[PDB]
A paper describes a structure:
Endo-N-acetyl-β-D-glucosaminidases (ENGases, EC.3.2.1.96) hydrolyze the β-1,4 linkage in the chitobiose core of N-linked glycans and are thus capable of releasing entire glycans from glycoproteins leaving one N-acetylglucosamine residue on the substrate. The active site of the family 18 glycoside hydrolases contains two conserved acidic residues at the end of β-strand 4, corresponding to D129 and E131 in Endo T. The glutamic acid has been identified as the proton donor, and the aspartic acid has been assigned a secondary role, stabilizing the intermediate in a substrate-assisted hydrolysis mechanism in which the carbonyl oxygen group of the C2-acetamido of the leaving N-acetyl-D-glucosamine (GlcNAc) acts as the nucleophile. The mannosyl glycoprotein endo-N-acetyl-β-D-glucosaminidase (Endo T, HjEng18A) is shown to be responsible for the microheterogeneity observed for Hypocrea jecorina cellulases and hemicellulases.
Although 46 amino acids are missing at the C-terminus of the protein, the overall fold of Endo T is a complete (β/α)8-TIM barrel. Seven zinc atoms have been modeled in the structure model of Endo T, six of which are located at the surface of the molecule. The seventh zinc atom is bound deep in the active site of the enzyme in a pocket formed by the catalytic residues. This zinc atom has dual conformations in the structure model and it is coordinated by the two catalytic residues. The Endo T structure also shows two single GlcNAc residues bound at two of the predicted N-glycosylation sites of the enzyme, N70 and N240 respectively. In Endo T, the conserved tyrosine Y195 is present in an almost identical position and a zinc atom is found bound at the exact same position where the reducing GlcNAc molecule is found in the Endo F3 structure. The β3α3 loop is relatively long in all compared structures and is located next to the catalytic acids.
Residue numbers in the entry: 5 to 287
């Protein structure tokens, strides 16, 4: 059900090392959260999968995993993301390995984490180069093992869907051609210099390059701690225009939860309330 409202949840504990609850996203009024992406999972050569600084089964994450059950009860799909800023998950030592046993070993760890933590999807946020063969295999294998209703997404930077600047090495247009039916949507990063939601031009260019609006989620920084943040009012103006063109867009994702403007660390759920008013103004 479009539009999706997706929140990345990377910072899991506050400055006092206390868990940050994800539950206000379902308990505070006026939020239509569709997906919560727990991140960032890391594949480590010679190691075990980590969620940020600890293995996901560590006591550090007891509160997190307990809360995910409640999120799912409320109708939110809980996914993981592997990759992001920290290199190591998609190189020739791990998931891009040309050694079959090495690939099976690290892939098996990812598969096992998905099963053990009862995730409903996986976002492959590839921010270092990975071969075409490697990404194609990973997606096809995930699809093979987890079935057609498991969610598989990627997080291209916006220009990577416009035949331009790309963090991932492989081609997203080639990927869409060969594995597009296995990919539910693209968490498209309109920030860091790679694209802008301040007008419709970038989103329209991506659509014209063969990526359906239903599969292009407009990614947004939730704070100006980075490059390319825009006010939600600007986001709204652009989305109104896009909807007039396409009827339905893929939705919006936010990087990342805990300190989101306007409410900050005190009230980080206010972002999701505002974006819900943008995407579903009749709710
Ligand atoms: C919930 O937390 C308890 C610790 O109080 C832990 O034993 C249990 O495994 C947790 N549940 C999940 C799904 O992680
Ligand atoms: C979005 O923009 C339209 C057109 O300017 C406006 O009517 C509406 O108030 C805006 N919605 C939100 C949630 O800001
Ligand atoms: Zn460790
Ligand atoms: Zn990132
Ligand atoms: Zn990113
Ligand atoms: Zn189905
Ligand atoms: Zn396929
Ligand atoms: Zn093109
Ligand atoms: Zn407030």
């Amino acid at each position: 059900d479009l539009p999706r409202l997706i929140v990345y949840f990377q910072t899991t504990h506050d400055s006092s090392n206390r868990p940050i609850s994800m539950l206000p996203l379902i308990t505070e009024k006026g939020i239509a959260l569709t997906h919560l992406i727990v991140c960032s999972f890391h594949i480590n050569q010679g190691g075990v999968v980590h969620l940020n600084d600890f293995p996901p089964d560590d006591p550090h994450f007891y509160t997190l995993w307990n809360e995910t059950i409640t999120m799912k009860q409320a109708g939110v799909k809980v996914m993981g993301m592997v990759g992001g800023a920290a290199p190591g998950s998609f190189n020739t030592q791990t998931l891009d390995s040309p050694d079959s046993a090495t690939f099976e070993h690290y892939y098996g760890q990812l598969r096992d984490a998905i099963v053990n933590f009862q995730l409903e999807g996986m976002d492959l946020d590839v921010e270092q180069p990975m071969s075409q063969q490697g990404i194609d295999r990973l997606i096809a294998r995930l699809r093979a093992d987890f079935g057609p209703d498991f969610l598989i997404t990627l997080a291209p930077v916006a220009s990577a869907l416009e035949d331009s600047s790309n963090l991932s090495g492989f081609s997203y247009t080639a990927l869409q051609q060969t594995q597009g039916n296995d990919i539910d949507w693209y968490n498209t990063q309109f920030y860091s210099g790679f694209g802008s939601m301040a007008d419709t031009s970038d989103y329209d260019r991506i659509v014209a390059n063969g990526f359906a609006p239903a599969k292009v989620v407009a990614g947004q920084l939730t704070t100006p701690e980075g490059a390319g943040w825009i006010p939600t009012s600007s986001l709204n103006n652009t989305i109104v225009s896009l909807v007039s063109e396409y009827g339905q867009i893929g939705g919006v994702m936010g990087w990342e939860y805990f300190n989101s403007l306007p409410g900050g660390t005190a009230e980080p759920w206010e972002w999701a309330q505002i974006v819900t008013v943008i995407l579903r103004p009749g709710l």
